[PDB]
């Protein structure tokens, strides 16, 4: 009955404010109670308050009392989460829910990463093998972006299950992943494979054909 | 305050073949209180299952104190960290959480190697990649005859076959990388007594 969506990732410097909006649709929204959760980088959820859109009604984890501050927007079926004085024990993944008896609905998740450094696009690099059997594993390297997410699709998401996309590690400041996928060679080098790269902070989408040599 | 403590932190079963939510203030003294079981697969949001309010493949067992999911039985698809969540109007929490992990038959590792590719070459670096893919268990270990700018990242267990795939790095500079010439990527896992080994001459 609900559906929830989240906006987008977000880089911001310490010592500002943002405003994270999670979109609703459905129906009966004022009956679903609105909140919100932090989940710092493989760490568990905590909560950080609630809304509820009928009544006005909000109560707040005591740890974000004067940092969080949520509104709802029954005009544009909105719920937003403003948070202040930012740093960097602040950046992880926030969730948006909506609940009631009947059913519940999680946003996608989005990604707040507060630091002052700027924006680093990916560098893509094609991973061909050298010189057997009839799979094929090819990879595909993004190297030293910031801050992350990063969305890895090969061949525009046309192949999938036959993919291993390895989280991004942290080294000298920055991310760098690799994610390898495995085709019949009967299907390689002939058919065209191809890694996509998402790199929505730098507004960035490159693809790299793989090649054989 | 109210404190949630699930046991056991980390678990694991094997297909076909129980955790714990214990509340230090129960979910009876509220009137509209209420406790969650949630599954969060890797890279997902949470997904509800199960509920208790106050006065098919999984159920809640226990007390009004202890909210007890249990799965049964334990599909392949199973794989994720499961939390619990206790709600009422002064405040919501959540558990700690545990970790579920499937048993299955030890799995020889498929290993590639490959080399720095030219657009790599021209910016001035080069990068050595050894995927080492859909392995059991987790444990494995990896290494002209380095161990420095080595960069190594696993997955999270497959939800399909139960796999685990580990990618590694090695990384030079333009010139350090032609002042040597075979790179042979090295991958010690238990089951293969030999240690599968990858190389490239270039
Ligand atoms: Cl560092």
């Known amino acids: 009955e609900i559906q929830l969506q989240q906006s987008g990732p977000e880089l911001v410097k310490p010592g500002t404010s943002v405003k994270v909006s999670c979109k609703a649709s459905?129906?009966?929204?004022?009956?679903?109670?609105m909140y919100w959760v932090k989940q710092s980088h493989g760490k568990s959820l905590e909560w950080i308050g609630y809304?509820?859109?009928?009544?006005?009604?909000?109560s707040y984890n005591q740890k974000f009392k004067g940092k969080a501050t949520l509104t709802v927007d029954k005009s544009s079926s909105t719920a937003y989460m403003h948070l202040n004085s930012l740093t960097s024990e602040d950046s992880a993944v926030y969730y948006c829910?909506?609940?009631?008896?009947?059913?519940?609905?999680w946003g996608q998740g989005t990604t707040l990463t507060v630091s002052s450094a700027k924006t680093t696009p990916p560098s893509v690099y094609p991973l061909a093998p050298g010189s057997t059997n009839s799979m094929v594993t090819l990879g595909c390297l993004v190297k030293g972006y910031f801050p992350e997410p990063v969305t890895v699709t090969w061949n525009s998401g046309s192949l999938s299950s036959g993919v291993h996309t390895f989280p991004a590690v942290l080294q000298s400041d920055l991310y760098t992943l690799s994610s390898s996928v495995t085709v019949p060679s009967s299907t390689w080098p002939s058919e065209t494979v191809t890694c996509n790269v998402a790199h929505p902070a730098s507004s960035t989408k490159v693809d790299k054909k793989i090649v054989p040599r | 305050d109210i404190v949630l403590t699930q046991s056991p932190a980390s678990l694991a079963v094997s297909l076909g073949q129980t955790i714990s939510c214990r509340t230090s203030?129960?979910?009876?003294?509220?009137?509209?209180?209420?406790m969650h079981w949630y599954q969060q697969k890797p890279g997902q949001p949470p997904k509800l299952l199960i509920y208790?309010?106050?006065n098919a493949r999984f159920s809640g067992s226990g007390s009004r104190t202890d909210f007890t999911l249990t799965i049964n039985p334990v599909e392949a698809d199973d794989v994720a960290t499961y939390y619990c969540?206790?709600?009422?109007?002064?405040?919501?929490?959540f558990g700690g959480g545990t970790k579920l992990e499937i048993k299955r038959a030890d799995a020889a590792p498929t290993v590639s190697i490959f080399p720095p590719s030219s657009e790599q070459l021209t910016s001035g670096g080069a990068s050595v990649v050894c995927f080492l893919n859909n392995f059991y268990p987790k444990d494995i270990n990896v290494k002209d005859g380095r161990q420095n700018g080595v960069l190594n990242s696993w997955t999270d267990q497959d939800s399909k076959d139960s796999t685990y795939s580990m990618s590694s790095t090695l990384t030079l500079t333009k010139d350090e990388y032609e002042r040597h010439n075979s790179y042979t990527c090295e991958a010690t896992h238990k089951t293969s007594t030999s240690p599968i080994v990858k190389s490239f001459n270039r």
């Open positions: 203030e129960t979910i009876d003294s509220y009137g509209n209180s209420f």
């Open positions: 208790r309010a106050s």
């Open positions: 809304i509820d859109p009928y009544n006005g009604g909000t």
């Open positions: 829910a909506g609940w009631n008896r009947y059913d519940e609905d």
């Open positions: 459905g129906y009966a929204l004022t009956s679903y109670t």
């Open positions: 969540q206790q709600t009422n109007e002064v405040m919501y929490t």
